[PDB]
């Protein structure tokens, strides 16, 4: 090695030392892939794809829409393989609107992203947006729109409890991932808290992994 | 719709007026030129340490 | 992009002054730096480098144990430090801007200097050429040679051409052999093999008179040659 | 009667140990590296291990025939060699224990705490630990003369001969006592977080993985306590005085020495057999 | 009923067209390559190997010099190596991490990246500064750009997920022209070496010749049964080759407007995400999903060899302006140079 050499091996070996220091700062935060048909509102706020950050008990979470993506999503969608979970976001008072229904739309939807290849072991953090809209409009009209197969009472509980049983039952092998049900709300910041618990338990299945004894 | 399709026709007109040559002379053509560039190709003929600049 | 230097004066023998240099203008921390002193009347001389990121501190050999090289990256400033001084550091000191990868131009920028008077197995670069009389619209070529052959077994040729107008900074005509530096009109070349090396003007203008430097990059401790002036 | 025989113990945990532990830094030579924590302290644990286990022939040689044919620098560097490196085990798999508890319930600080750089750190603190009983073994080891040759510390008898007893208490408290509670209450509350989290405790297979789990866990802690009990009273028996100096005395000393190098010879096949990413 | 004599005079003209290629189909490429000496075997091996990127590779692209080149990953980062001693020239942090093409400018000066944000960005190398800083940001697609490559200093020309392809200035910042005819999603482009014409392939499985200056599509090629995801001219320029989804490569025939060899075997069944050519065009290097790379015979349709050795999926591969080495970057974050 002459002397330019050597200090290019020396600017070199700089590199790879900010490199690593910029893939240790990027492998302590979470990441969030957020879905939808059917209401981004209190969600991601309470061209391209939309960046978010936020930080909630010195977790650093990074949350990602792809709703302006009109394409083909087999060929994006493993780019996010390695995410930390997937928020879906499936409204309620849609149930009798239609595009074919939007809450069928939803389901295709799930069963789709919930059953990729690439999202085999990825957690699912479900959100019920719009529960005081599909409250006052369960009395005006019945659930038999959206699911001949009802057979239950036409109150708000049983029908919310209905719908998330049917969102849920579409998860096949639901022995390597799980599914978190969430009905939103507006108080005390549980909407964040709970995607917190949610990505707090997957956390704990990478340090199983990481002390070799899951 | 109308607009869409005559823009199609259109476009298919200008493809199918188009000076094609055979198969076989273009074949040819191509076998010819990987002839004569045989020489110059180091990953078709490996080449010693002294002018492999990988090592 | 600026170096403004800083300090100087009148010191007595055995005293000790800290030179300064302010950086503008660029990235400082990505710069290695150099220090290089020119005799009131001789020609350039390196005194001191430091690295990128200051993990290489290397020295001159007549200073060496005198003098210490620093560097303060969030100040953008340079440190030269100076105990023990004799009557033969009096001298004008620049600071040198200095990048090195695959294609970089090493040497590229000088500061103003400052001027200091203190009161009372090296290759040499060879160049006889001194006080050559030019013409405008005339093609001079300035020869160079080096003790040692310059032709690394990588294919460099480790060879800077240098320019000082009167009352300027040295200025990088090329950096690598055959290589003009940015800014340089294309009438400047420089071609040879081995230790010898020439730099050709194909027609010089009235800016294109001055002292003309060597300066051989292959080893540390990096020595220069008693530069050739050219006069109409 | 006569039972010497027991000698044939102290070859089969000598060859099991060489055997696993060196085949542990296999591991580290064709499939693991340096890459996480676990595997730095693995890498000690399996070091310490082998360095006890190398030490088996020369009580083998001692229990056979009554006295030490080996010197008096060499006894002072393999005794220190032997406090050395049980130190430096039990420290490492209590330690173990501790990074074990802190990712699982505290799993937002394990994200900076769990980092090679804070293990070699900590590593580095454990041997600089046990090097001062390495150092006191070194200068108060020696040998002396009873019509038998005795290898142990010596202190001076004639006064203040209380300081061997305190020596005793001493890796009592920090070799027995605070690891067993350390590595019980990590584990205990490690083990009662995992059963409140969503997964690992569903249904079916996420069930029988943390039987798993806790099964390795229980294991783990009842060869440490299986094992290292015995040697300790024996210790504290023998220093306070309730058995006499017969052959009976000797073999089950030296059967309660071959217990704590089973310690030392299981150590791998449940750190290494075991363990997840060392599997595959 | 207007529509329905639109959709008939397509017809006729599509039977037409295919009317043509069969009468310009004289004798297929392995009855002529029949009588040719077959390429015995080729062992290449990792001579180099780039570490320092730590999420998945997406692109690569070589330098005109044959030793400098520029990868793409998902940490956000666009790392420009020496390739010959194995140095970090560069490391250029990106704004938006989701990048999935990259290019290196002819000159050397430049260099481009683009993605899910649907903006090529352009980067200048050589600044007074010692920084590598963001000289544009081309934008108005409305799709992600799977694929850029420079003609100069000042032109580029983009691929998008709007399916549509683009020509831009990039001192003016806007787009020269707009090549419109697709109908899936355009995957990957291929310049030609006199550069006043283009090929791209697309998700309708189909591929498109086009004239830069003229702005439309001159010829149309559809053997394919998938998506399109890798195009790459002949060195010559004559002809040029697809992989795509469906296990097979496909070399196309500009001048016959025909394909004319297809590379596939029964034990492939993944898809091709990028192919290339040699210096003299015999050799045809395609990335697969199964983790490894296979040089074809482009004249006999033999699989010449296997580079195998990356641990994950082979998602980018370049040859170099000499021929000298092959370069190929995987999702297990390493590149490696075969020789
Ligand atoms: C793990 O495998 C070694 O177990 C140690 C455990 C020690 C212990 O429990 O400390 C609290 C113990 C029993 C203390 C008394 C020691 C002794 O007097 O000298 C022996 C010696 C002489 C030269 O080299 C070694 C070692 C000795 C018998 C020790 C062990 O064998």
Redesign the interface.
């Known amino acids: 090695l002459?002397?330019?050499?050597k200090?290019?091996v020396?600017?070199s070996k700089?590199i790879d030392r900010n490199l690593r220091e910029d893939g240790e700062k990027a492998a302590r935060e979470v990441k969030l892939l957020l879905l939808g048909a059917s209401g981004k509102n209190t969600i991601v706020k309470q061209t391209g794809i939309v960046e978010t950050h936020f930080t909630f008990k010195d977790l650093h979470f990074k949350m990602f829409d792809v709703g302006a993506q009109r394409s083909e999503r087999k060929k994006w969608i493993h780019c996010f393989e390695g995410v930390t979970a997937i928020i879906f976001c499936v409204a309620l008072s849609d149930y009798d609107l239609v595009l074919m229904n939007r809450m069928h739309a939803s389901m295709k939807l799930f069963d789709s992203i919930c059953n990729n290849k690439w999202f085999t072991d990825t957690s699912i953090i479900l959100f019920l947006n719009k529960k005081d809209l599909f409250e006052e409009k369960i009395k005006k009209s019945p659930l038999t729109i959206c699911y001949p197969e009802y057979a239950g009472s036409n109150t708000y509980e049983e029908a919310a409890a209905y719908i998330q049983c049917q969102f849920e039952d579409l998860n096949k092998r639901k022995d390597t991932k799980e599914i978190y049900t969430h009905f939103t709300c507006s108080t005390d910041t549980k909407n964040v808290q709970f995607v917190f618990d949610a990505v707090t338990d997957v956390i704990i299945k990478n340090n199983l992994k990481d002390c070799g004894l899951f | 719709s109308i607009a869409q399709a005559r823009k199609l026709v259109e476009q298919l007109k200008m493809e199918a007026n188009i000076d094609r040559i055979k198969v076989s002379k273009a074949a040819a053509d191509l076998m010819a030129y990987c002839e004569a560039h045989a020489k110059e190709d180091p990953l078709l003929t490996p080449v010693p340490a002294s002018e492999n600049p990988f090592r | 992009?600026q170096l403004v230097e800083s300090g100087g004066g009148l010191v007595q023998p055995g005293g000790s002054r800290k030179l300064s240099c302010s950086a503008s203008?660029?990235?400082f921390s990505?710069?290695?730096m150099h220090w290089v002193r020119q005799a009131p009347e001789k020609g350039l001389e390196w005194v001191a480098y430091i690295?990128?990121?200051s993990?290489?501190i290397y020295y001159a050999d007549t200073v060496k144990g005198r003098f210490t090289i620093s560097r303060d990256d969030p100040k953008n400033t340079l440190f030269l430090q100076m105990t023990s001084l004799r009557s033969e550091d009096t001298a004008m000191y620049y600071c040198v801007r200095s990048?090195?990868?695959?294609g970089?131009s090493?040497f590229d920028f000088w500061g103003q200097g400052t001027t200091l008077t203190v009161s009372s197995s090296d290759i040499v670069m060879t160049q006889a050429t001194s006080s050559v009389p030019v013409t405008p619209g005339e093609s001079v070529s300035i020869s160079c040679r080096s003790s040692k052959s310059l032709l690394?077994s990588?294919g460099?040729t480790?060879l800077y051409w240098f320019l000082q107008r009167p009352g300027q900074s040295p200025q990088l005509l090329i950096y690598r052999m055959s290589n003009l530096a940015?800014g340089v009109p294309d009438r400047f070349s420089g071609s040879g093999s081995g230790t010898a090396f020439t730099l050709t003007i194909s027609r010089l203008e009235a800016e294109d008179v001055g002292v003309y430097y060597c300066m051989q990059?292959?080893?540390?401790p990096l020595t220069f040659g008693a530069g050739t002036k050219l006069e109409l | 009667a006569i039972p010497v025989i027991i000698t044939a113990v102290y070859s089969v945990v000598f060859v099991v140990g060489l055997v696993g532990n060196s085949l542990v830094m296999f591991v580290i030579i064709r499939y693991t590296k340096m890459k996480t924590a676990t595997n730095i302290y693995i890498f000690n644990l399996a070091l310490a291990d082998a360095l006890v286990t190398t030490t088996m022939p020369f009580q083998s040689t001692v229990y056979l025939m009554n006295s030490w044919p080996f010197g008096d620098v060499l006894c002072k560097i393999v005794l220190s060699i032997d406090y050395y490196n049980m130190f430096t085990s039990i420290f490492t798999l209590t330690m173990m224990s501790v990074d074990r508890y802190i990712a699982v319930c505290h799993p937002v600080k394990a994200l900076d705490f769990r980092t090679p750089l804070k293990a070699k750190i900590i590593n580095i603190c454990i041997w600089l630990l046990s090097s001062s009983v390495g150092i006191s073994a070194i200068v108060l080891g020696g040998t002396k003369v009873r019509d038998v040759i005795e290898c142990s510390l010596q202190f001076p008898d004639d006064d203040y001969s209380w300081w061997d007893l305190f020596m005793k208490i001493c890796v009592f408290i920090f070799a027995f006592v605070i690891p067993v509670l350390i590595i019980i209450v990590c584990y205990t509350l490690m083990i009662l977080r995992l059963k409140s989290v969503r997964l690992l405790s569903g249904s079916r297979e996420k069930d029988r993985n943390l039987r798993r789990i806790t099964r390795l866990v229980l294991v783990v802690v009842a060869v440490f306590v299986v094992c290292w009990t015995p040697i300790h009273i024996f210790i504290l028996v023998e220093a306070l005085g309730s058995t006499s100096h017969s052959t009976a005395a000797l073999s089950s000393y030296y059967f309660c020495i071959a217990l704590g190098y089973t310690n030392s010879s299981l150590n791998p096949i449940l750190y290494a057999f075991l363990d997840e990413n060392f599997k595959r | 009923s207007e529509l329905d004599q639109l959709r008939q005079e397509a017809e006729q003209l599509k039977n037409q067209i295919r009317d043509a290629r069969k009468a310009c189909a004289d004798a297929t490429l392995s009855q002529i390559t029949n009588n040719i000496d077959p390429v015995g075997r080729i062992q290449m091996r990792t001579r180099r190997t780039l570490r320092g990127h730590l999420a998945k590779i997406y692109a690569m692209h070589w330098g005109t010099d044959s030793?400098?080149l520029v990868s793409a990953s998902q940490d956000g980062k666009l790392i420009i190596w020496?390739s010959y001693t194995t140095?970090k020239?560069?490391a250029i942090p990106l704004r938006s991490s989701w990048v999935m093409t990259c290019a290196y400018a002819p000159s050397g000066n430049y260099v481009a990246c683009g993605g899910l944000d649907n903006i090529c960005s352009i980067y200048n190398l050589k600044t007074?500064?010692?920084?590598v800083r963001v000289s544009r940001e081309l934008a108005g697609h409305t799709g992600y750009l799977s694929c850029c490559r420079f003609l100069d200093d000042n032109q580029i020309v983009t691929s998008s997920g709007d399916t549509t392809c683009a020509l831009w200035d990039i001192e003016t910042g806007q787009q020269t022209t707009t090549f419109t005819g697709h109908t899936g999603d355009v995957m990957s482009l291929s310049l030609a070496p006199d550069t006043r014409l283009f090929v791209s392939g697309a998700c309708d499985a189909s591929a498109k010749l086009w004239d830069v200056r003229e702005g439309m599509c001159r010829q149309t090629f559809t053997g394919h049964e998938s998506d399109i995801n890798a195009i790459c001219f002949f060195p010559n320029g004559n002809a040029f080759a697809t992989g795509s989804d469906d296990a097979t490569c496909r070399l196309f025939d500009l001048r016959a407007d025909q394909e004319l060899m297809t590379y596939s075997h029964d034990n492939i069944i993944c898809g091709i995400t990028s192919v290339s050519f040699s210096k003299s065009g015999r050799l045809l290097l395609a990335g697969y999903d199964d983790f490894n790379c296979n040089v074809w015979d482009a004249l006999k349709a033999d699989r010449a060899g296997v580079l195998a050795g990356h641990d994950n999926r082979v998602s980018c591969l370049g040859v170099t302006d000499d021929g000298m080495a092959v370069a190929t970057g995987s999702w297990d974050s390493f590149l490696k140079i075969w020789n």
Do not use: K
Request: aromatic letters at 16%; proline letters at 2%.
């Open positions: 002459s002397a330019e050499d200090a290019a020396e600017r700089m | 992009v203008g660029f990235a990505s710069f290695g690295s990128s990121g993990g290489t990048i090195y990868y695959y970089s090493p690394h990588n460099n480790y940015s990059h292959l080893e540390y | 030793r400098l020496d140095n020239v560069h007074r500064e010692g920084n």
